Symmetry: C3
Subunit: 413 residues, 3 copies
């Protein structure tokens, strides 16, 4: 038959959404065999940079003093300032609670000591199994930076990630800081010249090719400022034009662009010091139109870029938009973004990614987003149901699978 009641439909959508294994196509997590770079712990959750920014709006403790404290002390301060002295109603604070509850811990007691004991008696491998199970995440895409001495080592040592973890080649240093990076390249055997000649071009391409072969990335990525433009006679513009795009096309690897971040407007805050700005769509429009054989994954930081980004996706099939990034990762914005996207793109987009920096975040990141996405799906199905259309649970499971996993794998080939 078909679904005949609004209740069955809802039960059906929520169940399908909750049961669908998720492919988180963009995170800052690492296969557990990569070592300490994989962050997890209630102390890591509480010291997430989102919460550092928030605690600094309340506490009288200087930023210097904060950075001087131990992670445990920072966590204690954040807990006291954001959870005890004021209700933890922000999205980031709410998330910490969702993680605790999901792990079987009880937020009702506010017993941070007891919460810590839970983690003290587990290994990274165990927690990963636990979390991926609780968050129903089957595949995690990492952010792998070959310019980070730490991460760099494991890749050179031939270490391969857990089969549940996939690599993504981060190129920010190369594209945004070529002047300083070119020195490290030549130091690694990549003889780039001071002038952008065929020699420099071939060496940069070799660097990319070497790492593509080494990581077997699902895509190459870069985060860009509000002022991003293309074409552009700059190191970034030339590298993208002469090296990145050609290589990406040859290996049929998508180019992921996270646009709109204004770095370090408040240096002292570190990762919590980045701001946002609306970008022009001209550069993305040009890339999509002039490079029809290249695939692009895009997410933008400014609320004001979201609707036009959806419209751009209507224009180019070689564009796949994804997630509600950072400052967009808040219920009010996730909801409006997801509705605009489905209304203009049907199911041809990737609703969300976690951008998790701490393992446990996969729990709240996906739990918070799934309930909103389910609500949107229920309304959209109810609307065509009202129009006389019949939908089957199989069709819903199909649609949900496309949104949470298939659209991505299908796009990166």
């Amino acid at each position: 038959m078909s679904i005949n009641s609004r209740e069955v439909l809802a039960e059906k959508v929520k169940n399908a959404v909750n049961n669908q294994p998720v492919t988180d196509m963009h995170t800052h997590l690492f296969s557990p065999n990569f070592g300490e770079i994989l962050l997890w712990d209630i102390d890591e959750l509480l010291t997430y940079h989102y919460l550092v920014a928030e605690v600094m709006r309340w506490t009288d403790v200087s930023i210097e003093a904060f950075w001087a404290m131990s992670k445990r002390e920072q966590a204690d301060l954040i807990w006291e300032e954001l959870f005890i002295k004021r209700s933890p109603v922000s999205e980031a604070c709410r998330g910490v609670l969702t993680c605790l509850q999901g792990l079987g811990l009880d937020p009702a007691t506010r017993d941070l000591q007891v919460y810590r004991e839970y983690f003290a008696k587990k290994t990274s491998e165990e927690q990963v199994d636990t979390v991926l199970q609780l968050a129903n995440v089957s595949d995690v895409v990492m952010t792998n930076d070959p310019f980070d001495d730490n991460e760099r080592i494991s890749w050179l040592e031939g270490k391969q990630p857990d089969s549940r973890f996939h690599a993504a080649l981060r190129l920010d240093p190369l594209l945004n800081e070529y002047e300083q990076t070119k020195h490290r390249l030549r130091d690694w055997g990549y003889k780039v010249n001071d002038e952008w000649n065929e020699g420099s071009i071939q060496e940069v391409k070799r660097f990319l090719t070497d790492w593509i072969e080494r990581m077997d990335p699902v895509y190459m990525a870069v985060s860009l400022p509000p002022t991003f433009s293309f074409p552009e006679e700059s190191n970034r513009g030339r590298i993208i034009r002469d090296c990145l795009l050609p290589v990406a096309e040859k290996h049929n690897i998508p180019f992921a662009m996270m646009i709109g971040v204004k770095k370090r407007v408040h240096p002292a805050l570190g990762d919590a010091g980045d701001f946002v700005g609306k970008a022009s769509m001209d550069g993305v429009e040009h890339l999509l139109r002039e490079y029809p054989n290249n695939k692009f994954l895009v997410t933008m930081l400014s609320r004001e870029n979201q609707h036009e980004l959806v419209v751009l996706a209507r224009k180019f099939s070689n564009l796949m938009i994804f997630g509600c990034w950072w400052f967009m990762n808040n219920p009010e914005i996730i909801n409006e973004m997801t509705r605009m996207r489905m209304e203009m793109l049907g199911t041809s987009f990737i609703p969300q990614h976690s951008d998790a920096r701490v393992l446990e975040q996969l729990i709240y990141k996906w739990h918070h987003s799934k309930s909103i996405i389910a609500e949107v799906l229920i309304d959209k199905y109810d609307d065509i149901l009202q129009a006389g259309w019949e939908v089957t649970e199989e069709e819903i499971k199909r649609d949900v699978a496309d949104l949470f996993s298939r659209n991505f794998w299908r796009f990166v080939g």
Copy 2:
């Protein structure tokens, strides 16, 4: 009786909204006596450019191959790709279903062949009577382009539109492509000079005057790019200043501006290749302030222009804003736009227009929009009812008539 609760209010409002005859002040429909230019058919509905854009995001069929197929083949592909392989949850797909259901056809069967048979046994005149009846549309405003050889002929042959259809003089070729258009003008007896002198000015005005007399348009219209500015030393700026405005004032005809469309960012897609951009409000502000004796109808394409456009309407009574155009014609946006408009303008605006290109679209266009507009009205009436205001059903019927028909006719005199 007494409307003394949100519940009674909801019933009375929905009834009033549903029963109110609609004047669709902007469409791409034509009086049936104008011939084949009047599109209608389930195949026409499925090949609407909104769906072409959407199918191209999914199908592997090349755009060239798509355009090579017959309309029936295109419709079959779109149906399979957007309705069968994925649930038809997008607004445009949902609309097709609403039309079918409204005509008495059953979407539950997904029998495209049976749907086609319905249309095969009807004439244009009959379908028009059927659709206008089902969509409860009493008056349709057309988009009449004197630069289109096809349409041009019927007007020259003295053919007059059905009394339910009204004309609107489209001037895009003249204002946006004067360099190429000036040649057609002189070829039609309008001796415009290479230089913008009094001779050219008088000839352009004569062209406008001749067509105003020929069509008896309710308003003159033009769609403009995000970069639109005024004053401006350009063909567009000079024609508007020296010809359009003076003539519009003399005949007391409103000037309609549809701002924000960036034409052909993806040429191969044809009508489905247009993009959007936020525009500056400076030009509109200047026109409203410096030409107090001219009337302006405005709608904008960018989500980011909507709130400030509402504020501009608060500033100038010679400005009438209307509808949720194109990329704004989606539930999430229609809702936010309609609420911002009513909150700052009360009932002094035109909530919607269909922009229908295919006859049957009047059904879903108005059905989808009316349910949203009705909900906004219920909230607003309830808020004053709870404040102690007594709203009568007659007052609701009056307000609803203003929003859906009278405000337009009152503005265009």
Copy 3:
């Protein structure tokens, strides 16, 4: 006794919100002992500039004729045009009704004459007691302009405001119209030179210092245009850099910036002729980063500046954002703004201010805003209750006190 259900939660929050005494940190009201500048009356409510703009969209009465009528005649016209000829559904009209109902008058009768009689038999001091009581407002922050001959007099006469009223030093003439203002300064004994030298700098600082000592303002304020930038080699840029900031720091007085207003786009409308524009965040960002020892209160006029303003607050603890100003003071916007703010800032912001120009407006301004703020809180508390957190009624009361009063006083010291 834990909060067992959302329904019970809804009640505790609404009670706390309704019972919490409000500090309205930005209004255009005056202590009753300041004289006629304190506007109150149903006629004043109806002739509020928000309604002037709205009536002009409907009435055929010329703007000249309108200004020529007496306040009573204007009120009669506005009442007839916006309440009788069309339902009073706009936010501003709804507000008038809420005020009447709150005062015990009955909107159901639409008896404007009877409403007027209520006010005719009361004094300013009495109405102030009545209104502050009904709106549950314990503290009102005024807008005091030393450049207004009228207001200026009472301050020079040593008149001190009622203890419920606080002063805020308005500096628009000085910062935005220095060229014309410098003449008044020297005329008052402040010997500023034509050139911006140390002499001019010291004299401007003396002017500020003299008025700070005279008003004992909670903060110094200025409203700025969409084009506002800083640093800037202009009178405004230099005065802010060399005089305002240093003085503000020395006295630890916050600098309030209301950004985005485009003055007089429609001169004839007077106060109702101001428009809006999106501003760059660069100037505010620079001020916050380069002047860590200065405190800034910011509110912006453009809908499109709201989200990034929230993000900027996440970056700088010396920034306190407040209210939904003017064109933002509409339910649809207040809701989205308040949700974005709480999601990214928890309770570290000031949700609203009335900007009341007419005494009675405190009633609707706060009643309309409180219901929305209460709904947002109910949702946010429900989300953490759902995550296992045990919110207590006393904690809700504390959070509510912070949002409506304590955050402000805590920020201004």
